[PDB]
Amino acid sequence: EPVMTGGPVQGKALWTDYSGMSKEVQGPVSQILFTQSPRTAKGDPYQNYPHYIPEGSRIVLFDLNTKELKVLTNDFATAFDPCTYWDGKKFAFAGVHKKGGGCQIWEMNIDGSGLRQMTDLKGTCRSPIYYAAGSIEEGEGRIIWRDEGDWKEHGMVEKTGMIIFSGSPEGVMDEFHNPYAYNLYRLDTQGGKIIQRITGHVLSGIEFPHLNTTIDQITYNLSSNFDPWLTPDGNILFSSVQANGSRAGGEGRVMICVDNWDGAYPRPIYGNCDGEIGGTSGRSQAKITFGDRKIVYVESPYMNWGVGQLAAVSWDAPFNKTYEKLTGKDGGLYRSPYPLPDDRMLVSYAERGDFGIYWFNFSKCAAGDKVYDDPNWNDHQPAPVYVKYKPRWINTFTAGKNFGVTVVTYQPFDQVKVEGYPHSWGTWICFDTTLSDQPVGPYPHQKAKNVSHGDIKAVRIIQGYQCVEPDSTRFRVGAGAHLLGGERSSSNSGTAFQQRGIIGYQYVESDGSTVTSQLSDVPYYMQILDDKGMSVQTALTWAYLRPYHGRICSGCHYGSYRGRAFKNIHAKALYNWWYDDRSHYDSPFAFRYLKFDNDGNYKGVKHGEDVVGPSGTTSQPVEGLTLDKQRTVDFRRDIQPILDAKCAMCHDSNNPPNLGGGLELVSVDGIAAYSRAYNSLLEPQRGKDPNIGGKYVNPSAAINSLLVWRLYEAELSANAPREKIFPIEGRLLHNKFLTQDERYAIVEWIDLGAQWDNIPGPDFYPGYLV
Amino acid sequence: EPVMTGGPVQGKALWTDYSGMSKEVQGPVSQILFTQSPRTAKGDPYQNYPHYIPEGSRIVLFDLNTKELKVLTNDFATAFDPCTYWDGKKFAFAGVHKKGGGCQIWEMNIDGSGLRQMTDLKGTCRSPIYYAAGSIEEGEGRIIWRDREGDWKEHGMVEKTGMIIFSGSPEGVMDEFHNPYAYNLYRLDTQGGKIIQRITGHVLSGIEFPHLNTTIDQITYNLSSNFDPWLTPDGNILFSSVQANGSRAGGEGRVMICVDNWDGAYPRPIYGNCDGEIGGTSGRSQAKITFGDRKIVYVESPYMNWGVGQLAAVSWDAPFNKTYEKLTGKDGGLYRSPYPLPDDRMLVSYAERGDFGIYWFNFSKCAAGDKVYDDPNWNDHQPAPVYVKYKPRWINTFTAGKNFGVTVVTYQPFDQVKVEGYPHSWGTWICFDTTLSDQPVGPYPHQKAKNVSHGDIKAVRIIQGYQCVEPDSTRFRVGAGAHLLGGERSSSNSGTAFQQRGIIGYQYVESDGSTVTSQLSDVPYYMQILDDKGMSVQTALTWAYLRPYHGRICSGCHYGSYRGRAFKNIHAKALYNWWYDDRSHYDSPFAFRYLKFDNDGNYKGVKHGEDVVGTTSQPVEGLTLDKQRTVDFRRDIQPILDAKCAMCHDSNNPPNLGGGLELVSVDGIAAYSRAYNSLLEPQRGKDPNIGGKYVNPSAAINSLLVWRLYEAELSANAPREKIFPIEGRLLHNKFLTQDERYAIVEWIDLGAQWDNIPGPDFYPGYLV
């Protein structure tokens, strides 16, 4: 039947309609594949979701007729996450082999034969799915490329598809300090020659020669991205954890979103914004119905749980008006929903707690007739066999790591090894930086004051540093529990903000437009700045650019990437982007420093000492591509000496705050992490949300910080830190105590999240030791 | 061991120390009682909590040693909620017998003999506990009273079994979530009223069960469910209360841990109901207190109506955020029904994957410890270990139950209705400062619409809530106002989350901000402070109740005097207006029916009604339930709109007030008129709980409509960015008289309902 569009004949859908032809191409379903896990904390660790390794689990095939069941995975100690191929005669999954090798991606046919190992990766791998690019019809396809030059066929490749999966390295911590950080990877199954078929060059990334496969990382988020799936328009639907800093009451949120299979254009779908339903509930295992086009997902009571109730929001219009509750009146737990083109669904359901496979009933808003339920197994992840129609494959302008593809001749190129760049780079542009749907408020993701065109002088670009602490004696979690951070603090910072550094600064045009070139394949976010160089509004999220890629946005959280059409805007920055035919991008790279006038106003942007094979492929000087020399503000190395020199003299235990004591660690509740000055400055204030700030300090807002208010001796923002600020008796002007560099160093420190240890891993600077 | 205080000897505790004496009197634990439930949605309906009737369940006795189990409940169709007596040789529970009779309260010896039915009620009964009042020691107490101007003499004696506090719901009622149950706490005389007669000198007033030789009295009048009562160290009742009132708590509501006296004289919050606290909308149930470190331990469910979930704890001595802990506390499963022992051990009902069992708790590993007993075919919960319980101190009661007070002078019981001649039970309350609050200036109804000082608050509006009762199923529909502000909690009666209400009356406020008044007793109520225009500046969202003859004091308006702070020392004018006369119970003025204003509509004074009827020196007013005034949109507002508004307001000139009382179909539901739908319409970028375009429920002063009717800026909260148009402006202040305008004001402050008359009536409404 036709769904999205009309067909050539009444009763039949056009070939451009995915959900319409998945109807017809499906075919009868006699058989189903599903995962059986032992019932144990460690047998079914859904509480650790996305990081899920149901040790001792098997993937099994059950036919709905004779009702036989066969175990395909018997060679594996652990097996889970079944995903069927297009024809339905084979599937891919995640497993731990009895011979070892860790938890990796595997694939085998439906009969149990043809076992092949996809991933040798060091880390954990799960959630494989088939996204076929350049492969529609079954067969072989041609590899063509260019050498004055021509386009020649160099021979062929079997066209099967690509594998999109979630994976995480080891010795890594997320923003919740869990010992995993997941992300999305695209995998060439032919050894990189499918990418070479599409792009004209083999996939760049981590290579697995012995397995004849290649992997590339399409999502750089510092927290876990997981459960990838297919959108009707041919993109990747998945779940993303945004924990960044104090965002969303400090507990962050798990959103359903989509991204291109090369990770070129990630955008939110539902759950990440204020006003939206579900709060801190976890959203996982999201799939889309064919008939009514609804995104159906598991809504877990707890953020990290993989089981819960069933929620739905229309894919066409993902808003609160289309939200609905599919379950919850039987008090049972649901997981792993699987919509069918027949407008049926297979759900894993535990009424009183024994999980089994059941047909879903939409009329009863609950689980229907039983398929297969073993009392000795949690039966979940149903994956029925049938012919799946194939989503559209979008053109990729990246060959993967360090590799871009020209927009002119479409020729793959390596920015590092060949062109001589220190690191792969890309661009981004905002048409209006003063344009927002956010009001003026105390919270860092809001405006600290009204800003018009010309009010925003420049922008700060910050790169998130992953938290890696191999030595457990040099790192402790919850050392700042008495401070603003709470349980999300650590030996590194007294706030919820983890270690990060400055990518660099970029000026803003008078109309509020800005554009810049910067590092790629790295997590980053940005802050709009006033004439004093302080952040008015902070973007709390993790953005990433693929090599040579660039990204546009209408405004600052204006909704252009969420719920609203692009506003038509003619911007100055557009003419600063690429004007030269011999260049990839003519847009300026992020500047390292700032220059101010005598009054402390913003004079402009200043170059650093990192300037750079290299080729002539850009007009502007190359700055900030060296990861080694990237600058950050560390409290011990930078701020503390300033405090000792210009402050601690008049500030002791008798004159709060107490800045004395130097770098000597102060024991709090049996934990010695930071010094006296840090503990003093990060101290909470009664009646104030610590997610906003403390007495003297507001993380990621300098303009809202009482300390900065006093250092500039003025009221900087529309949010007052407290009722009485400037004493009417015995007041002392603090504005002349510091130079501009020191004061703005403090400003930068606060805007960075006011950390303590900003240098990843154990270093020589004072800190937690046992 | 000494806990709260030092004892007579080192290592031993004073008898005044409840925790310590509980430690010393406990003894070794051998046998335990617990509930086994069938595993089904119908067999274990913990999603319907507080309303829980695990049909098919049984109560069993298990030996921790010989490991042999026995079913004591075999004669019952369903049994649950076991609670052991002080000696531990008998226990009380809830359930329905095979002979029928419904779900009731029973008690039985733990050997399985001596069954007795403590309750025969129309409704459902749950979670009985023993509260020993007048009985510390085993034996017979003597009954003594005054001879009606004679001496005090002894009449008879009574076996002292104490009393029984339980939670129960009537038949055919709806809560504020439109669930078909409303739970409240009841005290029960085990001896048939003569325990109360021993304490008071008159038998317990309330519903009598002469066949069971028992009597019950309702101690909590909250419109939503109060459930799972327990014992505090200081001798009060600890339980969970549902505060759903109106649009409060983001239109959701909260389940709070709170305490009250066994007669319900002094309800106060412990933890969970206030902004800035932890757990949000999480359900809080089955709370108990640890003996050693004195910590309240409760089940925190992710869903408000769920009875299973995690385990959290807060200090009893200091119930604040700083003392909040999450006991369990990670992987992988669910917890329910914790039971802290005096020896600091604990029994929890734990499900690792899917099925609950009895487990010792491990505080070091923050999870379930060694296994006690689990059947795979049963869900094993509600552990009730057998040991000796130390009796908490019993507090003096000044009420004999319904209509009955007890004087503070001679201490003799008196009936306010049958004898003294009052139409209804009446208590008093006093606030020393109505301008004193911990709340900031904000758009939400529980906050201040504007800054107010002494003298700025002229009077107060006292509002009685009406239980939602709809016998006819054809004339009532839930979710009729889904397109309006109410959302899912709306109905045929209201387009808001506010259910049906009425005005108890107005009371003036002294220049120092103090106020005192006499009003109805044993009815749910709350109040609003009013400015010189008679509009609510701040609304108290909760259900207060007064027992007969009982006064209730508070320092301020949500100031912390009843929550987190000490009473503020205040010398108030209202204090002298309370009781000055020898011949009177209370000399405080009753709530006035109306308010009278000046020419422009500013507050002049309070005006008596026609409901005015020698134990008080003031006119008795507002004690007649049938005469209680409310504001109905159809009867009161809509006519005014038709006469003075609908004229030039049509589809072309929004809002559209035309069409009269004719119903409008929205999403296939015909509930309200055109004017109601128009005025209750939501606004983009505005929290529906705050209000809509023209109407903010329970704030008139924040409403755009009222802003235009007075043609002025009323509050510090702007309804929208552009209020008054620049061109084409027309002044609306002269269109209405003060009566009509303030009628609209009253309508909005009441929650802006549609049907304010409970049950099916003759006025237009939903019909199918």
Ligand code: HEC
């Ligand atoms: C009976 C007392 C009423 C009520 C309750 C309202 N009106 Fe009127 N109205 C008229 C005109 C020309 C306007 C627009 C110009 C202006 O607002 O000054 C209005 C506007 C309103 C509003 C505001 C709507 C909004 O801003 O969105 C409201 C809430 C309102 N009205 C209610 C004209 C008349 C009129 C003569 C033609 C009469 C009589 C009324 N209105 C009566 C009433």
Ligand code: HEC
């Ligand atoms: C002696 C000349 C001082 C030097 C050197 C520094 N401060 Fe100071 N500070 C001093 C006084 C006498 C006071 C009293 C209050 C006032 O406003 O004069 C303060 C106060 C502060 C405060 C405000 C504390 C509060 O309001 O709670 C802050 C935030 C502060 N001081 C910080 C500060 C810094 C960063 C300094 C180094 C540049 C510093 N002080 C030096 C006296 C003296």
Ligand code: HEC
């Ligand atoms: C002003 C600062 C900006 C600018 C210039 C951009 N964004 Fe956006 N962004 C911003 C805020 C305040 C937030 C929410 C922060 C919070 O919730 O605490 C976001 C969020 C995002 C997200 C996450 C999904 C969402 O919230 O919608 C993405 C993805 C995102 N922003 C992308 C994005 C793009 C493509 C931009 C063009 C350069 C862009 N941001 C600019 C604020 C700001």
Ligand code: HEC
């Ligand atoms: C000003 C209006 C008052 C006055 C004069 C009193 N109370 Fe209190 N009340 C008030 C507010 C704003 C709230 C919270 C509303 C919300 O939505 O959260 C309350 C609530 C209560 C409660 C519930 C527990 C709690 O929130 O702490 C109780 C119990 C309570 N109020 C009792 C009470 C008493 C005994 C008073 C003395 C007469 C009293 N209130 C006065 C606002 C106000």
Ligand SMILES: [Ca+2]
């Ligand atoms: Ca099973």
Ligand SMILES: [Ca+2]
């Ligand atoms: Ca470090």
Ligand SMILES: [Ca+2]
């Ligand atoms: Ca069991």
Ligand SMILES: [Ca+2]
């Ligand atoms: Ca009615």
Ligand SMILES: [Cl-]
């Ligand atoms: Cl935007």
Ligand SMILES: [Cl-]
């Ligand atoms: Cl108070």
Ligand SMILES: [Xe]
């Ligand atoms: Xe269509």
Ligand SMILES: [Xe]
């Ligand atoms: Xe961003």
Ligand SMILES: [Xe]
């Ligand atoms: Xe109240």
Ligand SMILES: [Zn+2]
């Ligand atoms: Zn957002």
Ligand SMILES: [Zn+2]
């Ligand atoms: Zn409160």
